[PDB]
Amino acid sequence: YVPDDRVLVTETQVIRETLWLLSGVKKLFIFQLIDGKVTVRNNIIVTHLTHSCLRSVLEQIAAYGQVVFRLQEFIDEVMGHSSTEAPFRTYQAFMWALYKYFISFKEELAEIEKCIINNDTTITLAIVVDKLAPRLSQLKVLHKVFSTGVAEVPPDTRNVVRASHLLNTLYKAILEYDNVGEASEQTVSLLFSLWVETVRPYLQTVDEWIVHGHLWDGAREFIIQRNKNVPVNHRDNASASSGSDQGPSSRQHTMVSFLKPVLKQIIMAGKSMQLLKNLELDDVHDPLLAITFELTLRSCLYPHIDKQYLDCCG
Amino acid sequence: ELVKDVLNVLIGVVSATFSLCQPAQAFVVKRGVHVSGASPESISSLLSEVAEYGTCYTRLSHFSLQPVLDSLYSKGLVFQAFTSGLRRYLQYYRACVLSTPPTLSLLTIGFLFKKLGRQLRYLAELCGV
Amino acid sequence: MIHELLLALSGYPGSIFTWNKRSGLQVSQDFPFLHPSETSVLNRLCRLGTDYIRFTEFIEQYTGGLHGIYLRAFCTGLDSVLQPYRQALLDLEQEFLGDPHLSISHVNYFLDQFQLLFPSVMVVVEQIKSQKIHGCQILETVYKHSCGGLPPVRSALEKILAVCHGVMYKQLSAWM
Amino acid sequence: MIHELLLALSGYPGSIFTWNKRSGLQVSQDFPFLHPSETSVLNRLCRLGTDYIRFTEFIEQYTGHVQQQQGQGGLHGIYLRAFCTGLDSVLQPYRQALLDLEQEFLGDPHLSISHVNYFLDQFQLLFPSVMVVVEQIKSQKIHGCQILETVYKHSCGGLPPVRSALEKILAVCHGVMYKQLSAWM
């Protein structure tokens, strides 16, 4: 038999490699990446490991490696690192929340590293792998929200279709994990944090229109597209402050699910306020929120809106 | 440890220098080249920026320091008033330099004086000297 | 060897303990290094790892076929029964790291208590797959094996059943 | 490698961190002593630095450079000066943070680069954003008050930190406008 040459890396070196990989880093000697696919390096051997078993565990870490990498590639793309005046305004709110999650994850990985470098405490592959198990639980769910919300249609041509859909893979999958159990309360608290920092843009636009009386959006992000609002007020439906005739529809256009219950009230307070003129909604939801009760949590958001319609339209 | 010198380099001191001489040929700033005791070049570059501030102090302290002499025909009574006021500022500037904690981090000392460093260079340019 | 097995019992199979669909982690080789018969001891030990590899494939797909909020609750449970079987494979290595003489037998003795919880929690899982107990009749197949009688598998199945009762106390609290 | 990086980020280059006007800061990319894994991280860290140097150069270039001597809004103007006065004060926390890291390194003699990545990673996002606010000003030769709007359109930013960050600058610039309006009226 011919023996094949192998590097003989130490088991201690492997732990430093994975912790850097689990955080965003490229060009690691182990887990060599080739085409957006992180793959275990072909030849690495350790004194107390057979080549096959080491390949099995390493490939297994590398798979989590592929998820964190894809999220790092998206975050990178819309961080400003890269049209003329096209702030998408929702992908920016989602990536920012994703970044906050990536900061805290990178810090737990920093603590594990500090103990690994300056102590006699034994940290080996099995100890750390099982130490991170709650973080690895979170990543598989996070990959799923992304692989449907942003990867469902790969060409992804339309812009209103992309924003309505993302707010609808977040309002939908939170209900899915709502009654899963009360054991960890980890996955739901994570998904809910992504949800509040992805609707923050839509609820800035709604509040601006409900009292300032001007619907104001770019990239056609909002669902009541005022496509016919440019020339209608010359007429004095004809009052298409909200040309929902070209805005919400069952097939040609789309409506986000969470706002269907209050949709009719918003448009009519919106038109009412603009006629009244020709003569803190994110910061109100969060205060009431701070005091399986998922639909009921969204129930406490509505009275803030019912008050505006009842008063302004009156 | 070396920073102690830099602190007083804000005031005129000789550990570093502004030789009134031909740039480089005799004009000079104390520096360490090739072999040095814990001195990567950027430290010298950072030391050079403070120095710029210092050169101004010396020249400025000089421009205002020269008193009237009781026979300033070239300048007017009003020029003699300007200098007097300038010194009052220079004295306040000198007091802040002295107030600096004797104990402070090397990089921290520059970041602390940056606002003043430009403020004075501007004051310097305001006068031709 | 004592790190190849103390990971082979865990999910990573490796070269010694080859994995196969018809039978799992069945090492089949004549090795000068292990004693001729340690393979007989290992074969008995291999039975435990095969079910741990399989139990995680099942929790993976959940959490046309089986679907529901209960398979998202029996499965969270199969994670907690398996938790004292993860911490008890970490400690084996820690003792093994310093003591250079402890042999395979110490693995046998330390991991003999997991040959009563694991074989009888595997029939509950095959029952839930061979028969599509997808709706609320999943609670029946836990409380029908929970009366039990082998005491280690009698409180294990109790851990799984109570979790179901917490999902069944939240749907029935919103209604009433 | 440790004190050296703080020196570079602080805005003064060294041989290991070679300043090229085209390449901003750049590692030599070849040191047998350091394996490739740490290199990328440094490059990433360098980006924050690449921006720090450019900003200071620009601020230095148009601020206090002359005693008001074809000056025009792109070239100069009370407003252009106001943008600079603000740019440095908004960047102030970055200075405090870098200063603080040293205190910890003085406190402990062996802290990983990853530790650096974690503390400075909030700035990793604010700095690229502020860059476009200036980049638009230079290319369009934005003149006078038209600068006041250019920031305001980026005041709708989807990062809450950036929004607060830019808002500070408009408050500073308005001061002058409020100042000139303080007279004609």
Side-chain angles (χ1 to χ4, degrees), chain A residues 1-243 245-314, chain B, chain C, chain D:
Chain A
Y1 157 88
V2 64
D4 289 345
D5 69 313
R6 282 169 181 177
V7 313
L8 201 100
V9 83
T10 327
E11 176 278 340
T12 74
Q13 211 163 321
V14 167
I15 322 157
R16 319 206 52 251
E17 279 284 286
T18 60
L19 280 156
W20 284 327
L21 179 94
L22 286 156
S23 53
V25 172
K26 296 159 180 72
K27 319 199 186 188
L28 298 173
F29 76 95
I30 310 188
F31 312 119
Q32 69 187 337
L33 74 98
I34 73 190
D35 56 353
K37 293 179 179 179
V38 308
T39 314
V40 63
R41 171 72 151 77
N42 308 313
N43 280 34
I44 283 153
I45 212 168
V46 191
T47 59
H48 57 271
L49 295 174
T50 313
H51 192 84
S52 302
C53 55
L54 188 50
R55 182 182 65 198
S56 313
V57 54
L58 279 170
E59 149 168 339
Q60 170 85 223
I61 313 192
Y64 274 97
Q66 177 68 355
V67 168
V68 44
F69 165 70
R70 198 173 71 182
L71 298 153
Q72 185 64 60
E73 188 175 36
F74 168 87
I75 277 163
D76 157 71
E77 178 212 307
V78 297
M79 185 166 273
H81 187 279
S82 188
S83 311
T84 54
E85 183 65 13
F88 296 96
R89 285 154 17 265
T90 285
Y91 264 69
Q92 269 143 19
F94 170 89
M95 76 84 72
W96 159 236
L98 199 69
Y99 200 69
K100 296 192 289 276
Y101 167 81
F102 269 112
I103 288 153
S104 77
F105 177 54
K106 193 182 303 304
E107 155 152 13
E108 173 153 35
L109 297 163
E111 171 276 319
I112 291 286
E113 190 79 315
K114 191 189 170 64
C115 300
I116 287 162
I117 60 155
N118 47 31
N119 250 290
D120 311 359
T121 312
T122 297
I123 292 159
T124 181
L125 299 180
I127 314 200
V128 63
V129 158
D130 289 345
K131 208 282 171 176
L132 303 160
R135 297 294 181 192
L136 295 174
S137 156
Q138 302 208 32
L139 295 174
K140 183 68 180 295
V141 175
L142 208 51
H143 151 82
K144 208 43 60 197
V145 150
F146 163 102
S147 194
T148 271
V150 178
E152 183 65 13
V153 55
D156 82 287
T157 55
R158 296 205 65 228
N159 41 13
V160 75
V161 174
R162 282 194 307 274
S164 175
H165 182 119
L166 188 67
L167 290 157
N168 204 21
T169 193
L170 290 167
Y171 170 60
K172 183 178 179 180
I174 277 192
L175 301 194
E176 181 261 276
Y177 279 105
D178 187 34
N179 210 322
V180 148
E182 215 86 25
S184 198
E185 274 301 324
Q186 270 314 280
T187 293
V188 57
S189 51
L190 162 85
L191 288 170
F192 187 79
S193 97
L194 264 61
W195 182 88
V196 159
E197 287 276 12
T198 307
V199 318
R200 165 180 289 279
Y202 264 48
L203 283 279
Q204 300 222 348
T205 300
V206 157
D207 168 59
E208 210 60 352
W209 186 39
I210 295 285
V211 175
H212 300 88
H214 61 78
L215 182 57
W216 178 255
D217 61 356
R220 323 281 54 82
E221 218 71 356
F222 207 57
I223 63 128
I224 59 121
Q225 290 164 130
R226 45 151 185 176
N227 303 110
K228 215 177 58 169
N229 189 25
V230 182
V232 284
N233 190 36
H234 296 234
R235 293 182 183 174
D236 291 343
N237 289 337
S239 64
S241 153
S242 178
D245 289 345
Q246 306 191 236
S249 268
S250 50
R251 302 177 289 277
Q252 292 289 345
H253 313 260
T254 58
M255 182 243 293
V256 160
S257 295
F258 55 68
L259 69 98
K260 181 170 194 178
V262 296
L263 170 58
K264 199 58 57 185
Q265 297 270 114
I266 291 176
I267 280 181
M268 279 301 296
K271 293 165 162 195
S272 178
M273 181 51 62
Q274 206 178 349
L275 164 61
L276 194 80
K277 282 281 162 79
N278 273 308
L279 289 318
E280 47 187 324
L281 192 52
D282 194 271
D283 308 346
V284 156
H285 175 43
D286 283 10
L288 196 44
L289 169 66
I291 87 163
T292 304
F293 67 81
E294 214 302 317
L295 284 303
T296 299
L297 272 172
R298 299 268 141 69
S299 306
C300 300
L301 177 63
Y302 296 164
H304 301 298
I305 293 187
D306 202 356
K307 183 68 180 295
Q308 288 299 342
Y309 176 77
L310 170 142
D311 188 308
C312 69
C313 204
Chain B
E1 293 177 350
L2 295 174
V3 298
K4 272 71 184 194
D5 289 345
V6 181
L7 173 51
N8 314 310
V9 166
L10 289 174
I11 302 309
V13 292
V14 188
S15 185
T17 56
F18 149 59
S19 169
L20 200 183
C21 277
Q22 191 67 21
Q25 319 322 312
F27 181 109
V28 286
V29 171
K30 190 206 61 45
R31 60 176 182 183
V33 189
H34 301 121
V35 301
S36 304
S39 317
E41 293 177 350
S42 178
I43 287 182
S44 83
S45 97
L46 181 56
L47 178 56
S48 90
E49 202 188 16
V50 180
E52 293 177 350
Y53 313 158
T55 69
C56 313
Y57 166 79
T58 68
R59 297 196 210 87
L60 188 72
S61 58
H62 188 240
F63 161 90
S64 198
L65 166 64
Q66 283 299 126
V68 54
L69 287 307
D70 198 19
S71 294
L72 186 47
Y73 312 116
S74 81
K75 301 294 188 178
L77 298 165
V78 305
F79 175 91
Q80 165 185 359
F82 173 58
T83 38
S84 71
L86 174 50
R87 258 161 297 191
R88 302 311 196 277
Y89 159 86
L90 266 144
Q91 187 188 344
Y92 312 146
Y93 158 94
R94 291 162 211 187
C96 311
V97 166
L98 298 181
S99 310
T100 316
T103 50
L104 193 54
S105 148
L106 188 147
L107 275 66
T108 303
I109 294 152
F111 284 127
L112 169 64
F113 271 75
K114 288 308 203 291
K115 46 154 277 183
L116 186 53
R118 277 78 59 79
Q119 170 64 95
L120 177 63
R121 286 207 325 287
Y122 159 75
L123 178 56
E125 287 163 38
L126 194 132
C127 311
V129 157
Chain C
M1 183 66 75
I2 49 161
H3 202 102
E4 178 148 29
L5 164 64
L6 292 191
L7 280 188
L9 270 153
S10 198
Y12 330 108
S15 38
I16 296 293
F17 308 98
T18 52
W19 175 274
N20 162 45
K21 296 180 178 181
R22 302 173 49 95
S23 44
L25 300 173
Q26 288 219 114
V27 54
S28 174
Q29 281 104 354
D30 298 355
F31 284 133
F33 45 92
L34 288 159
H35 183 267
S37 72
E38 201 79 280
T39 59
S40 320
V41 172
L42 286 159
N43 291 321
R44 177 182 179 281
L45 185 54
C46 292
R47 294 160 186 172
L48 174 46
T50 297
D51 305 11
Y52 183 76
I53 279 170
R54 231 116 73 180
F55 278 36
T56 312
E57 280 185 13
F58 183 95
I59 314 175
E60 215 82 349
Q61 55 191 48
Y62 319 105
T63 65
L66 293 70
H67 74 283
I69 197 61
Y70 287 120
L71 269 288
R72 295 183 181 277
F74 170 87
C75 268
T76 273
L78 214 62
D79 278 323
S80 183
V81 298
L82 294 183
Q83 186 55 68
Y85 175 64
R86 289 142 185 170
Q87 152 62 31
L89 204 59
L90 310 188
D91 172 50
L92 268 187
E93 170 64 346
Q94 294 225 343
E95 299 186 357
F96 266 99
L97 281 171
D99 272 305
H101 294 297
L102 320 182
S103 64
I104 295 303
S105 305
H106 182 86
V107 184
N108 194 333
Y109 159 79
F110 205 89
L111 300 176
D112 191 29
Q113 322 144 42
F114 291 117
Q115 308 195 343
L116 276 164
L117 191 146
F118 279 39
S120 298
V121 167
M122 195 55 164
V123 319
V124 159
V125 168
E126 297 298 328
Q127 184 161 119
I128 294 155
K129 292 163 87 168
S130 76
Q131 308 166 15
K132 306 306 191 79
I133 318 315
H134 99 275
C136 208
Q137 279 291 126
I138 185 83
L139 272 67
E140 203 82 64
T141 187
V142 199
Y143 204 80
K144 168 182 175 69
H145 297 236
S146 182
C147 301
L150 273 167
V153 78
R154 180 161 185 178
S155 61
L157 280 155
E158 216 286 319
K159 295 194 188 176
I160 292 164
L161 167 87
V163 165
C164 296
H165 262 113
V167 163
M168 201 208 81
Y169 297 142
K170 287 180 336 184
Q171 296 173 26
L172 291 200
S173 173
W175 178 258
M176 310 174 58
Chain D
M1 52 161 167
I2 307 306
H3 208 306
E4 295 302 320
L5 185 55
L6 311 194
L7 257 303
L9 290 188
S10 36
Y12 324 87
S15 184
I16 313 305
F17 309 79
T18 64
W19 167 266
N20 167 23
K21 199 71 193 72
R22 316 212 74 259
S23 90
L25 284 183
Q26 167 71 45
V27 68
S28 314
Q29 192 48 236
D30 39 14
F31 306 83
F33 61 78
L34 78 93
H35 263 260
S37 45
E38 48 262 47
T39 314
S40 55
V41 174
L42 292 164
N43 297 103
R44 284 190 64 267
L45 283 149
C46 305
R47 294 163 175 280
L48 261 175
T50 302
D51 309 329
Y52 180 69
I53 293 160
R54 300 246 197 205
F55 293 2
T56 31
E57 195 130 0
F58 153 82
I59 294 181
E60 164 275 342
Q61 178 177 348
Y62 299 87
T63 219
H65 72 117
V66 292
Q67 316 305 94
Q68 208 80 74
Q69 315 90 1
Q70 203 77 17
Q72 197 264 356
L75 286 92
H76 303 96
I78 201 71
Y79 287 92
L80 195 272
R81 225 156 273 282
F83 190 91
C84 301
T85 321
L87 184 53
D88 61 63
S89 76
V90 161
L91 291 158
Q92 189 47 248
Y94 170 66
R95 301 222 180 91
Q96 192 76 10
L98 189 47
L99 295 174
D100 215 67
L101 268 179
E102 160 81 317
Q103 211 75 13
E104 294 198 58
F105 284 65
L106 173 63
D108 161 278
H110 281 299
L111 295 174
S112 190
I113 296 158
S114 53
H115 216 289
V116 181
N117 191 352
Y118 154 57
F119 283 166
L120 265 45
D121 228 31
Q122 77 180 20
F123 293 91
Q124 190 61 240
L125 77 104
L126 165 64
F127 278 45
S129 309
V130 305
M131 182 53 197
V132 303
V133 172
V134 299
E135 186 48 46
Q136 258 209 48
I137 297 154
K138 292 189 292 185
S139 164
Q140 288 172 339
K141 302 285 294 184
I142 314 197
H143 145 84
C145 290
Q146 268 294 340
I147 296 191
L148 290 172
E149 277 190 65
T150 315
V151 70
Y152 189 66
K153 301 322 190 183
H154 309 134
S155 196
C156 312
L159 319 107
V162 164
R163 160 153 187 176
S164 202
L166 297 194
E167 206 166 272
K168 285 294 300 304
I169 286 151
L170 182 72
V172 166
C173 319
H174 273 166
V176 322
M177 170 275 272
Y178 272 74
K179 169 83 44 71
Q180 298 191 300
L181 184 137
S182 91
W184 196 77
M185 278 197 42

